Amino acid sequence: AVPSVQTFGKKKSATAVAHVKAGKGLIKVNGSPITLVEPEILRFKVYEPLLLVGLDKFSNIDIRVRVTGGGHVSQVYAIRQAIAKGLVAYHQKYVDEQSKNELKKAFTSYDRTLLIADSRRPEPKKFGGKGARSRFQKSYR
Amino acid sequence: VLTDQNPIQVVVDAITNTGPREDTTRVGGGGAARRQAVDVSPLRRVNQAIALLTIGAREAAFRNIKTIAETLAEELINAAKGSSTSYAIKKKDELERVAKSNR
Amino acid sequence: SLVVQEQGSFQHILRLLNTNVDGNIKIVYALTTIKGVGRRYSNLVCKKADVDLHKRAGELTQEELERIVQIMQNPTHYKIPAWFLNRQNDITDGKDYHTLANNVESKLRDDLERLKKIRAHRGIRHFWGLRVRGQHTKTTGRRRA
Amino acid sequence: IKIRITLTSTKVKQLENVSSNIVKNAEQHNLVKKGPVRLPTKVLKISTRKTPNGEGSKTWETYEMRIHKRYIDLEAPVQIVKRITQITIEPGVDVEVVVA
Amino acid sequence: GRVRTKTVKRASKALIERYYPKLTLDFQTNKRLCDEIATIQSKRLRNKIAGYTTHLMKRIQKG
Amino acid sequence: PGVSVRDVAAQDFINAYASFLQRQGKLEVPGYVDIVKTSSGNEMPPQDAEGWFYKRAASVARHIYMRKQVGVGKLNKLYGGAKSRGVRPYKHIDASGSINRKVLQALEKIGIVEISPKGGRRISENGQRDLDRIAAQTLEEDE
Amino acid sequence: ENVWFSHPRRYGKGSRQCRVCSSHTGLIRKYGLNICRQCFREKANDIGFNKFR
Amino acid sequence: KKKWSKKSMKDRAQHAVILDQEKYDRILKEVPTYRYVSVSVLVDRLKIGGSLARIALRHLEKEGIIKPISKHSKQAIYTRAT
RNA sequence: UUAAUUGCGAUAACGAACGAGACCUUAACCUACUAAAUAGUGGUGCUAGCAUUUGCUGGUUAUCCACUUCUUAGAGGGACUAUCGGUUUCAAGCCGAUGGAAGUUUGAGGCAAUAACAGGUCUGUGAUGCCCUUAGACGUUCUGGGCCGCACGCGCGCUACACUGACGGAGCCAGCGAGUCUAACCUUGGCCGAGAGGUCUUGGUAAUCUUGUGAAACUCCGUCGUGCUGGGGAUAGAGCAUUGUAAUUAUUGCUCUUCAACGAGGAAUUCCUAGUAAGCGCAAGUCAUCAGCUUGCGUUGAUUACGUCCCUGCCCUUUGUACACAC
């Protein structure tokens, strides 16, 4: 039994399922490496956890991220939250719970939102206006 | 690539130099509303500095061949070093002058 | 850079196909300056003439000018699919004719006077100077003077 | 044989008690069965102006009708298949029989 | 928006007057006993009742 | 260890495939290229005359390799874009069905891509081999 | 009179009509109930549509 | 209606699309000591056409004195490598 | 004191009723009670690229094992300001920090006070009352014209003053939404075109079919490049067509052109507290045929808001009134 943990990162509609297991030490999204999606900005954004924690924690760990939903920023945010939670689950289930705790402490110290999923769910739109709170126009004569 | 010193340092120096420290508020006065010279706001100082740099950069970058990147960079360096020529700093000092005049 | 003699070949305003053209722009867009033919036809003609587009409008050969002349004279003789043209199945004969800067205005005036003479609703509207394509004229088309 | 009972009702309480009694009688009869597959609830919306004429503020209302569809796939002898289909019949819930 | 409605306040007071020893200062046990010690038509209403009940126990515990 | 178009960048690999197909020149081009605008929403035709058809073919073939079964309507919807409809607001408009169908036919003729059951078209064995060979040429040239 | 109804009314407002009051204006084709909006407002509660938001 | 203007002459730039030796040597002796170089830099500090500035940038970079920091479209940055 | 006649409280009031709350949906955190060839993993029924190194990408049911910890479900769990400080006739409350979903009733809606408009609706009725017509009638056979004539003024809006842009090429992301039975709905094609259309049904009585609705400013290489330009199809003339027994006074779509406004847009005037403003796009409504509209959803996202009545309005109390169809 190859030990795999299933986590998922969420956004407005972007769902990213992360499968983290014992392998050769790789990261792949949709079967393509996380390092070679070439956005030149979101590449560094998804590098953020890996850069901050180093390659010591991905010696023989394969993490596969399947994404669906949301725009590009929502997808990369779901990717980063899913991979963070997957590494946390790996370091809790198999590696030391102390290692998981210290990893989460480092993640929080860099940014508190790394651990917590965003929950600013879209506000429904009401009649008499183009948006959720905006009204149309008040012309008197 | 220019001004080989610390880029965030020149950025913050420009922010502080363009941040207005005396402003004017609408005082009712009675019939003829006047201006009142009010000191004191650090958050508004940095807020107005950011707003001033942004709108000066976009005013420079409107209807011309130079791109917003180099317009903004020139405005930041000019405001940081001090030249009395950048649009943000001129507006800030003119607002300062009217505030002191009606002080 | 490439050195061309400072002869009369460089003029501030020049003549081309009975119009006036200023250089310093692309050859294709100089053709677009011609009345009746625009960017689509200009780029089609240049591409089918196989003259490089990244090249400038400074040097142009006499054989190339005659090539463009012959293309505009007989576009169908140059295997053009005949739906790029601006006059399909004309009323005079039914062939395909490509207008010149003067020909397009003369043709437009001819069909305008034809509608007026035939006294259609379209002709009456064109006479009165109103909108004929069924637009809403209750709040639009005021400054018609 | 692979018979199938599918029910496409609107009242959730009657829907749920139909499903519950079906699965409980099947379990007490000790057969082989598949769990009740529960399709997404389909909500029919109608958005209309409150006013009959055109006067007033432009206010709207949405009438929603919720439809719940579930189904179960079974394999059994014909007699007990008909027995299970015809017992526990309730008004308001519509059920039908399909194959495969 | 933290002010309790008269129904919540009076229900908490009634619970305290006749079951002071039966319930303690912990919200979780307070609710897990309140659900069976009083009949309420809402889980959120039970939560509000038990929270105010805990607040009054904290009030009595000092004065 | 492991070369795949997913593992390679898209733009450089497709440019390499275009250059390779341009060098070979055995795709049996339809012949009315250089007159079409690749779609129906574009206001200006493409720039290179003898080009861009290698690019379109590479793009469609690679898209088929990513996907499983895809028809001409899917190609047109995929390549469509927002059209400047004058004063009326921009709306999505599909690509050119004729050009998508003809590039599918050209891929069929060259054997890069073949018909599939249940309706649709699938990247062929030799087409996949050539695609991965071009990608591997890219990994050998850049690294 | 063979010409009394010679002209067809297969479409438009001649075809669609209210099934309770013969009103041609305000019909709700959606879900094939064919009731004008003003009458649907009245009958929705028993028809099945219920108001939640 | 009203023209909302005075109908006076504008800047009327003479952006050079063709040049000579007298300007080629000037730009060649001027491209050094330029800390930041781009299309805007070339146009504003040289009074030359945009196309000529782009061609000169490409040629100078193909030879190689300045190196790029960003290849992003609409903004190219080149700094001379000492 | 926040939104509250919300409460704590003093008290000729006590006890109540209705409104507010309470309530019912909506989106959020569930590694549970129970899940299907519709979202997958390893051997396999068949096969390829990096090779005989342990994997990915592919492509399929009955040949099976472990799960809905991502779509959706039904007795259902938590969140109540939990805890720790500061402040008070040492009473309700306010202001700051933790796994966790946020500590402005979590955000948003639905019906909503014995009071009244002489507000709209007798053009939604086989709902009439009072009058109109009572066998050339307003009931009705067919042809047409018309919110498409304007001299003109006023409003929700859409496209724009462009180099943060227009275009050309490579990526290319949501579901609540819709769908032929007495004769067609949205579309999966062997053939042709940037266009509509034919031969059979893969779609049906529908989470499996259209549809991952592969739908847009979003990521890269260039052209236009400040000169009224490539932003205008305003406007007008040439050809193909789904619909209609008639699209002619472009219904609508696609090939071609002129250049008339546009240098922070005057008096004035409208919306915006967390994913709302705004930008861009998608579905239903009306439909024999086309959205620039409305109702819902999706992508990026907001400095000055925990403040004040200065303007426009309110609520309570006190007060003055020659007002009471009530300034």
Swiss-Prot record, chain B:
Query: PTM per UniProt?
Result: N-terminally acetylated by acetyltransferase NatA.
Taxonomically, the superkingdom here is Eukaryota
The residues joined by the cross-link Glycyl lysine isopeptide (Lys-Gly) (interchain with G-Cter in ubiquitin) are K81
Where does this one sit in the cell?
A: Cytoplasm
Assembly notes? Component of the small ribosomal subunit (SSU). Mature yeast ribosomes consist of a small (40S) and a large (60S) subunit. The 40S small subunit contains 1 molecule of ribosomal RNA (18S rRNA) and 33 different proteins (encoded by 57 genes). The large 60S subunit contains 3 rRNA molecules (25S, 5.8S and 5S rRNA) and 46 different proteins (encoded by 81 genes).
**Which family does the record claim for this protein?**
Belongs to the universal ribosomal protein uS7 family.
Q: What does this protein do?
A: Component of the ribosome, a large ribonucleoprotein complex responsible for the synthesis of proteins in the cell. The small ribosomal subunit (SSU) binds messenger RNAs (mRNAs) and translates the encoded message by selecting cognate aminoacyl-transfer RNA (tRNA) molecules. The large subunit (LSU) contains the ribosomal catalytic site termed the peptidyl transferase center (PTC), which catalyzes the formation of peptide bonds, thereby polymerizing the amino acids delivered by tRNAs into a polypeptide chain.
Q: What is this protein called?
A: Small ribosomal subunit protein uS7
Task: Tell me the stretch of the parent sequence this chain holds.
Answer: 123 to 225 of 225
UniProtKB/Swiss-Prot annotation, chain C:
What InterPro entries does the database record attribute to this sequence?
Rbsml_uS13_C, Ribosomal_uS13, Ribosomal_uS13-like_H2TH, Ribosomal_uS13_CS
- GO CC annotations on file: cytoplasm; cytosol; cytosolic small ribosomal subunit; mitochondrion; small ribosomal subunit
Kindly state a single biological-process term from the GO annotations of this entry: cytoplasmic translation
Residues carrying N6-methyllysine: K47
PROSITE patterns listed in its UniProt record: RIBOSOMAL_S13_1, RIBOSOMAL_S13_2
Cross-link Glycyl lysine isopeptide (Lys-Gly) (interchain with G-Cter in ubiquitin) maps to which residues of the chain? K35, K48, K79, K95
N-acetylserine modifications at: S1
- Gene3D superfamilies, per database record: 1.10.8.50, 30s ribosomal protein s13, domain 2
Keywords on this record?
Acetylation, Cytoplasm, Isopeptide bond, Methylation, Ribonucleoprotein, Ribosomal protein, RNA-binding, rRNA-binding, Ubl conjugation
User: GO molecular function: any one?
Assistant: structural constituent of ribosome
Q: Where in the cell is it found?
A: Cytoplasm
The record makes one more remark, namely: Present with 48100 molecules/cell in log phase SD medium.
The record's subunit annotation is: Component of the small ribosomal subunit (SSU). Mature yeast ribosomes consist of a small (40S) and a large (60S) subunit. The 40S small subunit contains 1 molecule of ribosomal RNA (18S rRNA) and 33 different proteins (encoded by 57 genes). The large 60S subunit contains 3 rRNA molecules (25S, 5.8S and 5S rRNA) and 46 different proteins (encoded by 81 genes).
Give the UniProt family note.
Belongs to the universal ribosomal protein uS13 family.
Record's HAMAP family?
Ribosomal_uS13
Q: State what protein this is by name.
A: Small ribosomal subunit protein uS13A
Taxonomic source organism: Saccharomyces cerevisiae (strain ATCC 204508 / S288c)
UniProtKB/Swiss-Prot annotation, chain D:
- List, alphabetically, the GO terms of the cellular component aspect: cytoplasm; cytosol; cytosolic small ribosomal subunit
Q: Mind telling me how this protein is modified after translation?
A: N-terminally acetylated by acetyltransferase NatA. Also partially acetylated by NatC.
Where this protein primarily resides, as one coarse class? cytoplasm
**Alphabetical UniProt keywords:** Acetylation, Cytoplasm, Isopeptide bond, Ribonucleoprotein, Ribosomal protein, Ubl conjugation
Task: State where the record puts the cross-link Glycyl lysine isopeptide (Lys-Gly) (interchain with G-Cter in ubiquitin).
Answer: K2, K13, K82
Q: Which GO terms describe its molecular function?
A: mRNA binding; structural constituent of ribosome
Tell me the leader sequence span.
none
Q: In terms of domain of life, where is this protein from?
A: Eukaryota
Compartments annotated for it: namely: Cytoplasm
Q: Name one GO biological process term.
A: cytoplasmic translation
Tell me, how does this one assemble?
A: Component of the small ribosomal subunit (SSU). Mature yeast ribosomes consist of a small (40S) and a large (60S) subunit. The 40S small subunit contains 1 molecule of ribosomal RNA (18S rRNA) and 33 different proteins (encoded by 57 genes). The large 60S subunit contains 3 rRNA molecules (25S, 5.8S and 5S rRNA) and 46 different proteins (encoded by 81 genes).
Similarity annotation: Belongs to the universal ribosomal protein uS10 family.
This protein is called: Small ribosomal subunit protein uS10
Q: Which gene encodes it?
A: RPS20
Curated annotation (Swiss-Prot), chain H:
Q: Which domain of life is it from?
A: Eukaryota
Record bears the keyword DNA-binding: no
Per UniProt, what is one GO molecular function of this protein?
Answer: structural constituent of ribosome
Coiled-coil residues are: none
Bias (Basic residues): 1-7
Q: What is its main location?
A: cytoplasm
Q: What are the protein's UniProt keywords?
A: Cytoplasm, Methylation, Ribonucleoprotein, Ribosomal protein
Q: Under the cellular component aspect of Gene Ontology, which terms does the record hold?
A: cytosol; cytosolic small ribosomal subunit
GO terms under biological process: cytoplasmic translation
Localization, per the record, is: Cytoplasm
What remark does the entry add? It is presumed that the precursor part of S25 is engaged in assembling of the small subunit, thus being essential in ribosome maturation. Present with 322000 molecules/cell in log phase SD medium.
Q: Which family does it belong to?
A: Belongs to the eukaryotic ribosomal protein eS25 family.
Q: Quaternary structure? A: Component of the small ribosomal subunit (SSU). Mature yeast ribosomes consist of a small (40S) and a large (60S) subunit. The 40S small subunit contains 1 molecule of ribosomal RNA (18S rRNA) and 33 different proteins (encoded by 57 genes). The large 60S subunit contains 3 rRNA molecules (25S, 5.8S and 5S rRNA) and 46 different proteins (encoded by 81 genes).
**Record-given protein name:** Small ribosomal subunit protein eS25A
Q: Which organism is it from?
A: Saccharomyces cerevisiae (strain ATCC 204508 / S288c)
Q: Which gene specifies this protein's sequence?
A: RPS25A
Q: Which residues of the full protein are shown?
A: 24 to 105 of 108
